[PDB]
A and B are shown apart, each in its own frame.
Chain A
Amino acid sequence: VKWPEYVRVQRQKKILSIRLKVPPTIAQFQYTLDRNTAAETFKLFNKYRPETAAEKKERLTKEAAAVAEGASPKPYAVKYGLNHVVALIENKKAKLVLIANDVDPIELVVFLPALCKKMGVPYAIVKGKARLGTLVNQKTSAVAALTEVRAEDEAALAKLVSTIDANFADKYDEVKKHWGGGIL
């Protein structure tokens, strides 16, 4: 068989991702949250979709069509920029910080799991920047945080913290050690 240039490059990059010995601040990724806990994290995170551009436009025209002719609490949503998440973390305004494992330059998000372990922020490296993108009206998100919450979802969030602490942080205490990628 004969493949294209770019196909050969991404296949070569795939086998290069495995066969090299890798520094332990990377490969701290790919030791990621399993299927049940990931689905359960999103069962909470899907309840806080940031109000999409169409929804925001129609509502704020509803404000105009009503209020100009003839009280609300602050609404809660997931928080999704890297400047803003690393702002929220270190201010301790973060209760659950979700980090993508696949980022275009890897160097972007390498400090973040260990800065979360430093601040005492209960983090989870979840699989897919696309999968984080879906819950946030963006193609990709790299990071998603949950600062404040409705009280109906509060107990579920606190348990999501404790499940992620037990499932992720306790199973992967060896991941701060051990250079990954020694696969023969």
Chain B
Amino acid sequence: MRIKKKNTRGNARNFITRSQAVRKLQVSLADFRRLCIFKGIYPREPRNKKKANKGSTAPTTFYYAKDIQYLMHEPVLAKFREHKTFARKLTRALGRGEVSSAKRLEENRDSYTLDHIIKERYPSFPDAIRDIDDALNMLFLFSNLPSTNQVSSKIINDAQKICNQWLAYVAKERLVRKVFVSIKGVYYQANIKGEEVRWLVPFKFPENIPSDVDFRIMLTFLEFYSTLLHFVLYKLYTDSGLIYPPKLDLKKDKIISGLSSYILESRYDSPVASLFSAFVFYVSREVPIDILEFLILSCGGNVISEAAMDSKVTHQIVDRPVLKNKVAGRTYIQPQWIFDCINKGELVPANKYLPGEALPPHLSPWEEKKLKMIMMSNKQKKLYKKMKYSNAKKEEQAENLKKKKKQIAKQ
């Protein structure tokens, strides 16, 4: 052989720069990143960064060559091109002054579907449920958003619809194990086909949207997770449960627009799923309902709200320092009791949960050696000193918790 050129072989055809990926695809950076979001493609780290370049030490991100080289032939890229053609051919109609032909161009418009993009991403159903962890976190955030000029109302209404479908199913087949109310929101854990998904729901207050965040990146994630959730929910309902999609009662959606609405027709294993059976809870006005009625209906209780007005009831959930009525028939609880009954599973006594007293701390469900240092190498001294510092920074923080507990317990 002739002397081969140096920096064109091993790591140079294994990886490519962002610029080289964009150029090779002949696609805009935005659309390159849109496809990258849909396909689940990410930058990868080579063992040599400069052999992955053509010699240069430079701030560079490396994609996998065969990954981009596999993205090139794909229906979604072709449909992006078709959207670009449609865009100019519409503004041709609009810019001239003809409205009827433009309106007709809307009628003769097909759009890209993210159907086949999931088959190649999550080939098995249990793999899709391993992703639904991050998928349900976007979607439940986007339900609790005011619609802006960035994000249309149709987007939020469809996202909220999927959210309500998810909440309805989990409360239907009784698949909750753990709850955790934090400052951030309310965490749930759910054995969905026996693999424990986790997801977060914010509190139902108006959310201050920063102008800092980019509502074009988040919209494509929503666009992928949305379709992914449609296919997941069809699979779940048509396997073990119900018809999809279920209908919604109009005068129920006028009252709550939550979870007691949206009725679903068809044609246990865990202690949590057997709890609250033959119990009827009267949720008061003061507590948030949609974060709580999900849990009651999931375990096996029943809900009658103060809100619905605007019997069999055995417990009332009230958050006031002064409670007015006080009947002999009901038992009076601050919601912390429910948030502990789900976590333990053993029905915690309501003696520490009376209206007017302070709640329990609410835990999450989640010499010679200095002399024998010497005979270690530098490649072992560096590592051992690092492990010593990592244990020290833990133990001193544990000492901080103990010292703070002692300083508070005195007061």
A interface, CB within 8 angstroms of B = 46, 49, 52, 54-55, 134-135, 137
Contact = CB atoms under 8 A, between A and B. Distances in A.
Contacts, number: 13
A134 B98 CA distance: 8
A55 B96 contact: no
Nearest to A137: B98
Interface of B: 96-98, 100-101, 104
A135 B97 contact: yes
A141 to B, nearest CB: 12
B97 A52 contact: no
13 contacts: A46-B97, A49-B98, A52-B98, A52-B100, A52-B101, A54-B100, A54-B101, A54-B104, A55-B100, A134-B96, A134-B97, A135-B97, A137-B98
A52 B97 CA distance: 12
Contacts of A135: 97
Nearest to B96: A134
B278 to A, nearest CB: 63
A67 to B, nearest CB: 23
A29 to B, nearest CB: 24
Nearest to A53: B101
A131 B96 CA distance: 8
Contacts of A46: 97
Given A49-B98, A134-B96, 5 more contacts: A52-B98, A52-B101, A54-B100, A134-B97, A137-B98
User: Which of A46, A49, A54 counts the most B-chain CB atoms under 10 A from its CB?
Assistant: A54
Contacts of B104: 54
Contacts of B100: 52, 54-55
A134 B94 CA distance: 11
A85 to B, nearest CB: 21
A26 to B, nearest CB: 29
A137 B104 CA distance: 15
Contacts of B101: 52, 54
3 closest A-B pairs (Cβ-Cβ)?
A134-B96, A134-B97, A54-B104
Contacts of A54: 100-101, 104
Nearest to B95: A134
Contacts of A52: 98, 100-101
A46 B104 CA distance: 20
B143 to A, nearest CB: 41
Nearest to B98: A52
A54 B104 CA distance: 9
A183 B96 CA distance: 35
Contacts of A49: 98
A46 B96 CA distance: 11
Nearest to B103: A54
A55 B100 CA distance: 8
A133 to B, nearest CB: 8
A46 B97 CA distance: 9
A49 B97 CA distance: 10
A49 B99 CA distance: 12
Contacts of B97: 46, 134-135
Contacts of B98: 49, 52, 137
Nearest to A51: B100
A143 B83 CA distance: 35
A54 B100 CA distance: 9
A52 B105 CA distance: 14
A76 B35 CA distance: 51
A119 B98 CA distance: 34
A123 B298 CA distance: 80
A43 B97 CA distance: 12
A124 B100 CA distance: 29
Nearest to B100: A55
Nearest to A46: B97
Nearest to A55: B100
